[PDB]
Ligand binder design. Structure first.
Ligand SMILES: O=C(c1ccco1)N1CCN(C(=O)C2CC2)CC1
Ligand SMILES: O=C(c1ccco1)N1CCN(C(=O)C2CC2)CC1
Length: 130
């Protein structure tokens, strides 16, 4: 229905706003673009499904997310990739992991405060019906 297409349009507006607020935070600059294969040629041998905030924007506009649960799976993948590739005790790995955990926690906190639970439940029930 037109009413259901309006629901998914409102979801996309919400997701673009959250993603922009993450992408302008100086702590999260390292997560804004894909890892450069020329600088880190080993990255794509270890990390099987790369993800970053520019790719998340592209996926919103492709209509890949029908629920906020769909979106948070990709935020969780950005974080888990960083914890997997950078697991060591040295300061450079520890700084990346602290920033990855802060990206995940900040996304969840914005969504807890600003996403209505009944709006998310409506999105889930339309998705289930298709
Ligand atoms: O090895 C490097 C690197 C980049 C330039 C020179 O070395 N990196 C940084 C980028 N990496 C990430 O995991 C970023 C968190 C997304 C992988 C580690
Ligand atoms: O579906 C929702 C939601 C957000 C706002 C209204 O409904 N979310 C957030 C809360 N979630 C968590 O896993 C919490 C970290 C434990 C699951 C996805």
């Amino acid at each position: 229905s037109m009413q259901e297409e309006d629901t998914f349009r409102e979801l996309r507006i919400f997701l673009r706003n959250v993603t922009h607020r993450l992408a302008i935070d100086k702590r999260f600059r390292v997560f804004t673009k894909p890892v450069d294969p020329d600088e880190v040629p080993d990255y794509r041998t270890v990390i099987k499904e790369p993800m970053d905030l520019s790719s998340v924007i592209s996926k919103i506009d492709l209509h890949k997310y029908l629920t906020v649960k769909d979106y948070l799976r990709d935020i969780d993948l950005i974080c888990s990739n960083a914890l997997e590739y950078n697991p060591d005790r040295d300061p450079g790995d520890r700084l990346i992991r602290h920033r990855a955990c802060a990206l995940r926690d900040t996304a969840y906190a914005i969504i807890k405060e600003e996403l209505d639970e009944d709006f998310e439940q409506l999105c889930e029930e339309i998705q289930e019906s298709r």
